Ligand binder design. Sequence first.
Ligand SMILES: C=C1/C(=C\C=C2/CCC[C@]3(C)[C@@H]([C@H](C)CCCC(C)(C)O)CC[C@@H]23)C[C@@H](O)C[C@@H]1O
Lengths: 250, 11
Amino acid sequence: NSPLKDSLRPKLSEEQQHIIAILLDAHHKTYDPTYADFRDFRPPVRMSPLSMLPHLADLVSYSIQKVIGFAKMIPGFRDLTSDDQIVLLKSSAIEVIMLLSNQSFTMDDMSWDCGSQDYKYDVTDVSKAGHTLELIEPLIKFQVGLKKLNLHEEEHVLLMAICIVSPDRPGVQDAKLVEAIQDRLSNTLQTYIRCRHPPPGSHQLYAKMIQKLADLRSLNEEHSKQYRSLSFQPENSMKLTPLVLEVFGN
Amino acid sequence: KNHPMLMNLLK
Ligand SMILES: C=C1/C(=C\C=C2/CCC[C@]3(C)[C@@H]([C@H](C)CCCC(C)(C)O)CC[C@@H]23)C[C@@H](O)C[C@@H]1O
């Protein structure tokens, strides 16, 4: 075989395997499947208007901190300017949180089940945090469609990293460098799927995963809209956390 | 725009 023909044969390079290893570890170190810290949040109240906002605000604020910790471990991420790291996290946080949550989501009853009845969230809980079907229905649909992909954890953490390092985010300065970082991750994912995800599950899997990124942009836009409306009321904004205000807007 | 807490968590 010619060097060309042989070079066309897909192979997970040592560097690409290394990238996957780092992202798996990063996820391990920032997602607690025991959910032990939820005790620390303001208590969930299920009955009054916005009764679940304090608890879900605390959950989300906690999860933003975890997203930041994961982002810092993405190969290339820290070579970005402080400003670009900030804009990428401000814009992606809600999306990565939606991705992370797929781990607790269950299609048994279409809820996020975090180990106990107190920490099991359904569409009614989300509405009681100030959100409407315009966000919630598509969010459930997203969770269902993602679950249907039955991603390998490898693919799950690659997707989160690709989500974070997106060059077309608002406020991005060195889009060229963000794009180079993302491309290394995207190629790693494409090659992982070809070499490690057996058919039929692999069918158009990359394209399906990129469609989920597009879905996340739409969810982000609608969340931002409802969040601005929600936070416009000072009495609501009072119930949020300082980190949520800084990241999602004030 | 100043994101002190984000900036500090990123250090
Ligand atoms: C967080 C995590 C979890 C679930 C995520 C959920 C379920 C409840 C509703 C949430 C929090 C959605 C809400 C639209 C976000 C509301 C935020 C705000 C009130 C500030 O506008 C986004 C993700 C959803 C649980 C666990 O998987 C850890 C993960 O890390």
